[PDB]
Amino acid sequence: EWQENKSWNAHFTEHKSQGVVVLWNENKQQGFTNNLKRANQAFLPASTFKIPNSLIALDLGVVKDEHQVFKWDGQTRDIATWNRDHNLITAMKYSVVPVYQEFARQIGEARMSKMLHAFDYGNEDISGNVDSFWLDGGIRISATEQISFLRKLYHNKLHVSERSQRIVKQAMLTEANGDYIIRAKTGYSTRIEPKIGWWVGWVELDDNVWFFAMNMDMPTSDGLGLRQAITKEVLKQEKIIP
Numbered sequence: 150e151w152q153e154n155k156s157w158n159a160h161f162t163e164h165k166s167q168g169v170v171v172l173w174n175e176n177k178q179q180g181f182t183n184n185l186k187r188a189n190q191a192f193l194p195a196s197t198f199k200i201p202n203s204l205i206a207l208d209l210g211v212v213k214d215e216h217q218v219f220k221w222d223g224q225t226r227d228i229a230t231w232n233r234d235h236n237l238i239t240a241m242k243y244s245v246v247p248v249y250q251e252f253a254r255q256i257g258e259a260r261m262s263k264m265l266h267a268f269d270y271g272n273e274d275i276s277g278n279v280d281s282f283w284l285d286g287g288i289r290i291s292a293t294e295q296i297s298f299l300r301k302l303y304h305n306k307l308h309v310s311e312r313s314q315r316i317v318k319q320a321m322l323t324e325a326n327g328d329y330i331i332r333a334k335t336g337y338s339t340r341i342e343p344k345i346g347w348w349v350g351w352v353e354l355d356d357n358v359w360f361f362a363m364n365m366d367m368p369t370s371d372g373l374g375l376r377q378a379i380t381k382e383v384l385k386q387e388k389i390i391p
C-alpha cells in the first residue's frame with residue numbers, strides 16, 4: 150500500500166534538481182514517495198551494486214572477512230582514496246570500484262547471474278562485461294526494487310549465510326548517534342544516460358526501521374552531496390530524524 154506526497158518535490162526544486170525519494174515504514178508496512186512513476190523506473194545501480202557484490206564475494210569465500218586487505222595494484226587513478234590498500238569496510242566507504250571489479254572477475258559470470266536471480270535483484274541481467282556490467286551493462290533496478298532487496302538483507306532472508314549478511318550490514322554503516330543509525334550505500338552513474346546519483350539504505354530507530362531509496366539527476370559531480378542532504382530533509386520533514 151502506497152501513498153504519493155508531491156510536497157517532497159520542493160526539496161528537489163529548491164536545489165534546481167529532479168528525483169525521487171521512496172520511504173518504507175516497516176512497522177506499518179506502508180510506503181511513501183514523491184513520484185510513483187520514477188519510483189518504479191529502472192536505472193543502473195552503479196556503486197549501490199557493492200551491496201550484493203559484497204554479499205556474493207563473502208558467501209563464496211572470495212572475501213574471507215572484513216579485515217582481509219586488498220592491496221592497491223599500483224595503477225594511479227584520479228580518485229586519491231583509491232590509490233591505497235583497502236578492506237571491505239573502507240572499500241565500501243570510498244566506493245573503491247577497482248577492488249569490486251576484481252571481486253566480480255573472481256565471482257564469475259555464472260555464479261554472479263545465479264546469485265542475482267536468487268536475490269531477485271533488479272532485472273537480474275548481467276549482460277555486458279563481468280567487471281563493469283553494473284556501470285555500463287544491462288543490469289537495472291528501481292528505487293522500490295532497492296527497498297525490497299534491502300528489507301530482505303535487514304531480516305537476514307537473502308539466500309546467503311547470516312554471517313555474510315551481518316558483515317555487509319556492518320560495512321554499510323554510515324552514520325550513528327544517540328537518535329538513529331543509518332546503514333546505506335551511495336551510487337553515481339555516469340556511463341549511460343540519464344546521469345544519476347543513488348542513496349539507498351535504512352534508518353534504525355529504537356522502535357522501528359525506515360527503509361529509503363532515492364535517485365536524482367546528476368549532470369555534474371558538484372551535486373553529489375544532495376543525495377544525502379535531500380534524503381535527510383525528507384526524513385526531517387516526516388519527523389523520522391530530529
Ligand SMILES: O=C(O)c1cccc(-c2ccc3ccccc3c2)c1
Binds near residue numbers: 197244335370373
Ligand atoms: O559516490 C559514489 O557512490 C561513487 C561511486 C563510484 C565512483 C564515484 C566517483 C567517480 C568519479 C568522480 C568524479 C568527480 C567527483 C567525484 C567522483 C566520484 C562515486
Ligand SMILES: [Cl-]
Binds near residue numbers: 318322
Ligand atoms: Cl555495526
